[PDB]
């Protein structure tokens, strides 16, 4: 830690605060976290071969004093602050196409590696002047596991959070991932959390409310899931057009299917970067008031 001097807290993560920091030496401006089982250490440090342009680089692991402290690349603004700063308008459609598109390149390259985020979140999407989005914390959940409360103990939230793991599903896919970024991109569009549960059951309630209570039909198998009542209210499935307006319907098709129940029935990212609303994407810059 010698090495750095922090600059200013720039959020509190799951794990822990994260600081802009400068490396003493190189004078390189860097994000600090501070966080040990051996297990975590060999899981962590191989994020560090995980690389692409749309995942927040890892520079290095420290563990000191059974101590640690991973420093990441630098970004000037996360997702969650970008969106509440364009409330008044919304984040134009072609950027939010731009952004869905590059993050979905990431997803597709860290799934391709059989990593899984597990815990996307607009707070872990970090966005530079350049119009390019990066996906952050990927891999931190399996190395250290999603708690139920921040270190802080604030609350994880659950709003982006996929129904097979909410079903009690031990061992869910990269398909949950793709789940969250459903979630993301209709909050982008909309200006709203798609489902702001409250509580896990709120949260199951709140997609069965939308998407109708999954059955057999749609989800073979779900009945048998951990968690899944009998009991559970059975909602009608409503429309995507009332659900994401005024997407059109390249975007409101790629939602519909990144959202499907049946965790093996859902897009890739893969697949989801060939759908025909990627068409026309192009790559603009966001106003940024750094
Ligand atoms: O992945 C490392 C990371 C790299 N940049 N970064 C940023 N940068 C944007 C920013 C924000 C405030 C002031 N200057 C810059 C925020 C968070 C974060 C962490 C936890 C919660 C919210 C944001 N994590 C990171």
Known sequence: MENFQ???????????????????????????????????????????????????????????????????????????????????????????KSYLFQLLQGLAFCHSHRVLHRDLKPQNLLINTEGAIKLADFGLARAFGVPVRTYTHEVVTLWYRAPEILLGCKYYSTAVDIWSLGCIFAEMVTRRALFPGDSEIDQLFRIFRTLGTPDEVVWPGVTSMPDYK?????????????????????????????????????????????????????????????
């Open 230 to 290: 009998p009991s559970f209210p059975k909602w009608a499935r409503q429309d995507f057009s009332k659900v994401v307006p005024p997407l059109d319907e390249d975007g409101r098709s790629l939602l519909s299917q990144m959202l499907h129940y049946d965790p093996n029935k859902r897009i890739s990212a893969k697949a989801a970067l060939a759908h025909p609303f990627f068409q026309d994407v192009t790559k603009p810059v966001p106003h940024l008031r750094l």
């Open 6 to 96: 922090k600059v200013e807290k720039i959020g509190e993560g799951t794990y822990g605060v994260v600081y802009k920091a400068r490396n003493k030496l190189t004078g390189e401006v860097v994000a600090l976290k501070k966080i040990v089982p051996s297990t975590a250490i060999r899981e962590i440090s191989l994020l560090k071969e995980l690389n692409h342009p749309n995942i927040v680089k890892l520079l290095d692991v420290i563990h000191t004093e059974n101590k640690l402290y991973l420093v990441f690349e630098f970004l000037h603004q996360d997702l969650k602050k970008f969106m509440d700063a364009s409330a008044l308008t919304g984040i134009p459609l072609p950027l939010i």
